[PDB]
Structure 1
């Protein structure tokens, strides 16, 4: 019997035949390590995007910002990261401040819930708010 640990928390005679010698006289071109380093980055799956979705309790995740503002901020973060990877002060490829007037662009954020209402107050808080306005207690 064998067991495998989880990666995520759960609910709880001569033999030297004449062709085996080694003459490592060949250098790959392009180099093996060089290609491996590049493809290592491309292996990685794209990042999760949890924002705007509910949690175990029912309250949505994210930050209370306008959707258009959130999209713009994400574009700026992308440009800054792009500059970071290219080892330059200013990114040559920019996702923000392009020619296109993308003023109607929206991005998913935690400001709005599934009903289309505002998350100024969390879902669970409103549910408790409503359900406690109707309870009754023992007589005097």
Structure 2
């Protein structure tokens, strides 16, 4: 929560418990706020597995060993 932490730093700055300058509890509804997130990768997917692990599994799906 970035607006909550900004309001908390605003309250911590000048000797208060409640802040006069808030970033949450605005009267304006914006339910479509999309900040950047680590859940999304670059190319339109999730980041449940990291990309290096994905590429490693992709190239380890085909290996070839020596004959006996």
Q: Could you state the TM-score of these two structures normalised by the residue count of structure 2?
A: 0.96
What is the match of residue 116 of structure 1? 44
Structure 1 CA distance for aligned equivalents of residues 2 and 61 of structure 2: 41
Structure 2 CA distance for aligned equivalents of residues 121 and 135 of structure 1: 21
Structure 1 CA distance for aligned equivalents of residues 30 and 6 of structure 2: 16
Structure 2 CA distance for aligned equivalents of residues 76 and 110 of structure 1: 19
What is the match of residue 139 of structure 1? 67
Shift of 1:105: 0.6
The Cα offsets for residues 39-60 of structure 1, whole Å up to 9 and x where unpaired, read as: xxxxxxxxxxxxxxxxxxxxxx
Q: Does 1:84 align with 2:8?
A: no
> Cα RMSD over matched residues?
0.6
Q: Does 1:107 align with 2:40?
A: no
Q: Could you state the TM-score of these two structures normalised by the residue count of structure 1?
A: 0.48
Shift of 1:86: 1.4
The Cα offsets for residues 89-137 of structure 1, whole Å up to 9 and x where unpaired, read as: 1001100011000100110011111101100000000000010010100
- Structure 1 or 2, whichever has the larger Rg, is 1
Q: Does 1:126 align with 2:54?
A: yes
Structure 2 stretches lacking a partner, 5+ long? none
Consecutive aligned runs of 4 or more in structure 1 exceeding 6 Å deviation: none
Structure 1 CA distance for aligned equivalents of residues 14 and 34 of structure 2: 28
Structure 1 CA distance for aligned equivalents of residues 15 and 38 of structure 2: 33
